């Protein structure tokens, strides 16, 4: 499973599809018409040495119900230059982005351990998106 975390979001829960249940692998999450400034937040119970991440949106039957113009940000516990240029003014590093509804990648190990993952919606969208896979892989 995923590292134990408190999860939260500015997107209103639709018909009991809680983000908690999605982070526990039980159900999907409806993200209805995301707006610029919306966020999805995963705050790990303890800092996590993260190897890689995978977020999937859309599904069979609803293949268009994907997250658009959303980034993947990580908040290191502590405060390469290539990764340095990805720093945002709030301390997060903007390391990933959704495309075709999928965001996947590696964490620069210089960032570890991570205290939070944040998905940031950058632009308005008319889609009723389905976030159906959240995978954060610990380092071994």
Author numbering: 381 to 459, 465 to 525
The authors write:
N-Acetylglucosaminyltransferase-IVa (GnT-IVa, also designated as MGAT4A) forms a β1-4 GlcNAc branch on the α1-3 mannose arm in N-glycans. Downregulation or loss of GnT-IVa causes diabetic phenotypes by dysregulating glucose transporter-2 in pancreatic β-cells. In this study, by combining bioinformatic, biochemical, NMR, molecular dynamics, and crystallographic analyses, we discovered that the GnT-IVa enzyme has a unique lectin domain at its C-terminus, which is critical for its enzymatic reaction. Comprehensive glycan binding assay using 157 glycans and solution NMR reveal that the GnT-IVa lectin domain selectively interacts with the product N-glycans having a β1-4 GlcNAc branch.
Because we could not obtain diffraction-quality crystals of the wild-type lectin domain despite repeated trials, we introduced an alanine mutation at D445, which corresponds to D877 in NagH and is supposed to directly interact with GlcNAc residue. The D445A mutant was successfully purified from bacterial cells and showed no retardation in gel filtration analysis, indicating that the aspartate at position 445 of GnT-IVa also plays a critical role in the sugar binding, as observed in NagH. We successfully obtained well-diffracted crystals of D445A mutant and determined the crystal structure in unliganded form at 1.95 Å resolution. Six molecules exist in the asymmetric unit of this crystal. A DALI search revealed that the 3D structure of the GnT-IVa lectin domain shows high structural similarity to those of NagH [PDB code: 2W1U30,] and IFT25/27 complex [PDB code: 2YC431,]. As predicted from sequence analysis, the structural comparison with NagH GlcNAc-containing disaccharide (GlcNAcβ1-3GalNAc) complex demonstrated that amino acid residues that directly interact with the GlcNAc at the non-reducing end in NagH are completely conserved in the GnT-IVa lectin domain. Four residues (Y819, W836, D877, and W935) are completely conserved in GnT-IVa (Y394, W410, D445, and W513). The position of D445A is slightly buried and there is no water molecule corresponding to the hydroxyl group of GlcNAc around D445A. The activity of D445A was reduced to ~62% of that of the wild type, indicating that the glycan binding ability of the lectin domain is required for the efficient enzymatic process.
